[PDB]
């Protein structure tokens, strides 16, 4: 029926997800630390995500299977075995933090490139903050008694012991909602909008300058008197002086020589001879085709590459947001519109618990799925496979 099949499928998913996570994270870690071409900005953060995934998937699923197939927490005959029911919730709430703040950093840094020590400092700060924020959940769980098989045996559960724990259990659900699924989903969107606007502006400016140069060339080629060449060369000079600023300190020498030839042609036109002005402007085509086309192509390719990395940088966050929502959606129904007298009675009371189990399962499966997409969507990793 429902319960036996639920237990069997839970054991199966735990057993498979264990090795799936170890394989994925070990593979990604090896590639990151060995491939000299792989190492870059985002790759350190991705390796951090993989390692945070591994440090949760190594131990936490086997003990869940133990509880599934035994009904009793292991190591109950000793005295240390209590703190496991503290370590089990300690790790989990840590790992999600690592996955959350990082998906803000990927949004923070990716925009900055479009607009080392810093990465190490950010990683250390993120890890320290996530570990610090997960101590209440460790201090909350503690052993509780009951009578079973004739002995006072124990089940790991949350008990109201010290006023700090009380104040924690009042608002833990809403604090989790307001932190782990609210701030990133807005910050990433804001940074995405900023990045898209900036990229569009840069493309527009570059295209406008190049088009100005080409159309002015064509106009001078068909010119007939002094005024036309004068105005066209003035526009050319303005466009070249505006475009020279985009060069990062090769290309600057080319822009300087272009402006110099424009100045010579302008002087010849000022002297009053149109034909000599056309002859002077003839040489501009060679400098164009030998200095400007290359830097235009390089800039276009580089901006393409930045878009390409942002693609996966945000596919990760969209997958995370899709995965975490249903559990909170099912919890909030049992907290705002709880099955007091509202609807369906026996159906809803168990329905909320059923989707809570599904939410737990999907939240755990997020701790394995991310490598799959990184390889499948990014494509760059495939090249390294």
């Amino acid at each position, epitope marked *: 029926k429902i319960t036996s099949a639920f237990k069997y499928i839970n054991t199966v998913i735990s057993c498979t997800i264990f090795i799936v996570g170890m394989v994925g994270n070990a593979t990604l870690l090896r590639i990151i630390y060995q491939n000299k071409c792989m190492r870059n900005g985002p790759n350190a953060l991705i390796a951090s995500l993989a390692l945070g995934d591994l440090i949760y998937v190594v131990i936490d699923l086997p003990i869940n299977v133990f509880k599934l197939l035994a009904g009793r927490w292991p190591f109950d005959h000793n005295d240390f075995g209590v703190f496991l029911c503290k370590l089990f919730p300690f790790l989990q709430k840590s790992s999600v933090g690592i996955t959350v703040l990082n998906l803000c950093a990927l949004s923070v840094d990716r925009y900055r490139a479009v607009a080392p020590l810093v990465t190490a400092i950010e990683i250390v700060s993120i890890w320290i903050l996530s570990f610090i924020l997960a101590i209440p959940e460790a201090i909350g769980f503690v052993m509780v008694p009951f009578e079973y098989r004739g002995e006072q045996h124990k089940t790991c559960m949350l008990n109201a012991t010290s006023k700090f724990m009380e104040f924690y259990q009042d608002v833990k659900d809403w604090w989790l909602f307001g932190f782990y699924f609210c701030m990133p989903l807005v910050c990433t969107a804001i940074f995405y909008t900023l990045m898209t606007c900036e990229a569009r502006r840069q493309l527009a400016d570059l295209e406008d300058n190049w088009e100005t140069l080409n159309d002015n060339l064509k106009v001078i080629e068909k010119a007939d008197n002094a005024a036309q060449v004068k105005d066209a060369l*003035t*526009k050319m*000079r*303005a*466009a070249a*002086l*505006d475009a020279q*600023k985009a060069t990062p300190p090769d290309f600057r020498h080319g822009f*300087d020589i272009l*402006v*110099g030839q424009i*100045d010579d042609a*302008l*002087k010849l036109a*000022n002297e009053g001879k149109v034909k000599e002005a056309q002859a002077a402007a003839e040489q501009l085509k060679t400098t164009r085709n030998a200095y400007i086309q290359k830097y235009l192509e390089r800039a276009r390719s580089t901006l393409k590459q930045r878009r390409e990395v942002a693609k996966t940088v945000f596919c990760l966050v969209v997958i995370f947001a899709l995965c975490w929502f249903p559990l909170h959606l099912s919890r909030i129904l049992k907290k705002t519109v709880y099955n007091e007298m509202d609807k369906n009675r026996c159906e809803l009371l168990s329905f909320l618990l059923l989707m809570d189990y599904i939410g737990i399962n999907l939240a755990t499966m997020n701790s394995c799925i991310n490598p799959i997409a990184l390889y499948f969507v990014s494509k760059k990793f495939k090249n390294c496979f």
Partner: antibody
Amino acid sequence: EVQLVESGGGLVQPGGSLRLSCAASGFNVVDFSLHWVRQAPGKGLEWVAYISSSSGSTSYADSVKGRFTISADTSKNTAYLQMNSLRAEDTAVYYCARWGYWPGEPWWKAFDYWGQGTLVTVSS
Amino acid sequence: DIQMTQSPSSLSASVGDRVTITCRASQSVSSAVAWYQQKPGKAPKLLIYSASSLYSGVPSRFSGSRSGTDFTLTISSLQPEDFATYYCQQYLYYSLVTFGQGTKVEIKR
């Protein structure tokens, strides 16, 4: 010790001729271009003429074309301006300014050194 | 050709006040603007070049900015020495040089 002095100002009759001077100390005329700027009394600023000795290039404003001539002397390190056929509008204060050449910062620096000025009066 | 318009024409402000002068260009001179200061009976001196840059020796209160084809000169502290006439200039090329009309700052009472 960059320094410029002008001379030659005075009172002239309508339809006359006059000659100014611009002496430069602390630099060479073969590295900078020279400009003249006007200021009518109780009015704004106006551009007049331009000389470059290295390329031997000259340019004039629209209102003063055909009546002014501009030249330079590298041995004496001076610039010369000659006016003919003066009118009553020509009375103003004249300034001599220097400007660099294109490659680099001197072009961006614009007019950075100016003379003290010379007064011309067209009187009857 | 390439006319330049200076919007304010006479400003009354006291010491410790903020003043802003605007300048507009007809064509699209890239960043070739300069700001000049003139006191009565004296030659002009340079303050700002390339639409944002400080000459050596000028006070650090002076500032300039560019937005499209509109240029703005700002002064945050109005010391007594800062009461004179101010001029705008564009220097795209040697034979194409024009000046603005001029803006005068005067005491308020």
